[PDB]
Amino acid sequence: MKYAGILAGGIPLPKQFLDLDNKPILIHTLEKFILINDFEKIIIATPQQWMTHTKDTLRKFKISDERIEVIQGGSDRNDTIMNIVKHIESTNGINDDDVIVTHDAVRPFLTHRIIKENIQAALEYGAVDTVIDAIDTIVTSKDNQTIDAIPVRNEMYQGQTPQSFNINLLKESYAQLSDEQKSILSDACKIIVETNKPVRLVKGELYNIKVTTPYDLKVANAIIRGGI
Amino acid sequence: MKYAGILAGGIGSRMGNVPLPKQFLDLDNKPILIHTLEKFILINDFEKIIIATPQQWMTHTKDTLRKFKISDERIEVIQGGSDRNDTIMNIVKHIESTNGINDDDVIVTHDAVRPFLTHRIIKENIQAALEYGAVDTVIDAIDTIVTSKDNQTIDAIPVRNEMYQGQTPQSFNINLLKESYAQLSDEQKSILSDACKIIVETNKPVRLVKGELYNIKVTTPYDLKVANAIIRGGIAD
């Protein structure tokens, strides 16, 4: 069993529901996952305020895949992931070989190739990240004023999503973490990295952007029009 | 004295059936290099605005300046270097052999292929270079940043709050830049990807100036589609 977890639990209307070429970003994203028959369930987690509106939007764009379920998101991004996990466990349980492909609702340009690679690398190695090589030199700062270090750019990668995990592995490593450890995370693959278990790399795409600021939405509107 | 070093070097010899190199390709009917150069021209603080370019492209650069009626005597076209930092040092050697280097000189280095920098960015670079001697133009990382030493598996995922996308300009006190460059071995030089790591390898500080999300580097066709959208929708306004 392969499960898809569309993360839309973050807070005009929230960015995930904004129109990209007369169509909510969430719909753009979800269409990619619908085309993959391998998914047992495609779960959209969203704030309680926006659950009925999400289901209205699905209806409005004539999407009625019974594989789709809308559930309530979490405190933080990782908590939303864990809510989707708890939903799967309390409705059909967790096989010890099940994987979940978590993906940002605001990353509507992921590709069929990206998803299929994610699922096969999760089946093989248990934890997967979607990245692209750093184009900018990457810099670090421990004070937001002066540089701390400038690593070898060759070893730096822009982390995207999907991020796909073995559900048992993800739950066990999340339980290993403290509340302080959890609070400093920014993605889900550091759950696995912090517990000293491997994370394979899948290559994303340069156009697999996160659409949150208005600048991003103009880039996304150009990517749509120019068929990128 | 404050100097601008527009980096348009390292363009390899190319056949005529390939489009023009990225620095010279048209963006809204204007070479990207000209878009970049216009911002520096508007700043009177600069004693010279030096464009370094491969030997093959010097005459074409000067034709291009003429074509867009650019006749600022502060602009000079010189031959670039073997690598990016070598191009910077060529600009330094030009400055020193034409005006000398005063100990209060700063140079504002910038990729010709980042045409969307702003007046704000350049001014902050100049003055932060005067105060702290070395400056990087960066933006807070939006993606989580990851490291891998084998292109297969992750080694580490640092705290994103401390990670930054390095952009340009990069601005230095010229003597400081020269001294720290002279300290480096050829191996160290070969592994650098920017100019601020010259200063960082020699354990001297580098101040941070915040850039802009549209201060993108135009190299791939994808970037040119993004850059045409930035132009059309007036997002650098």
Ligand SMILES: Nc1ccn([C@@H]2O[C@H](COP(=O)(O)OP(=O)(O)OC[C@@H](O)[C@@H](O)[C@@H](O)CO)[C@@H](O)[C@H]2O)c(=O)n1
């Ligand atoms: N309580 C919450 C908060 C947010 N969300 C969803 O999560 C998506 C991204 O959220 P956001 O746009 O704000 O970006 P983040 O700072 O969280 O980092 C992400 C970054 O790490 C990653 O894309 C990649 O880079 C790693 O490889 C959005 O769809 C939100 O709806 C959720 O479901 N519940």
Ligand SMILES: Nc1ccn([C@@H]2O[C@H](COP(=O)(O)OP(=O)(O)OC[C@@H](O)[C@@H](O)[C@@H](O)CO)[C@@H](O)[C@H]2O)c(=O)n1
């Ligand atoms: N012999 C050479 C080689 C390159 N150049 C110029 O350098 C510009 C960018 O070059 P390139 O697009 O190829 O990318 P780089 O690998 O050099 O990285 C840059 C990255 O570090 C920086 O933008 C930022 O991210 C860090 O803060 C281009 O205008 C080239 O003409 C030169 O004049 N002479």
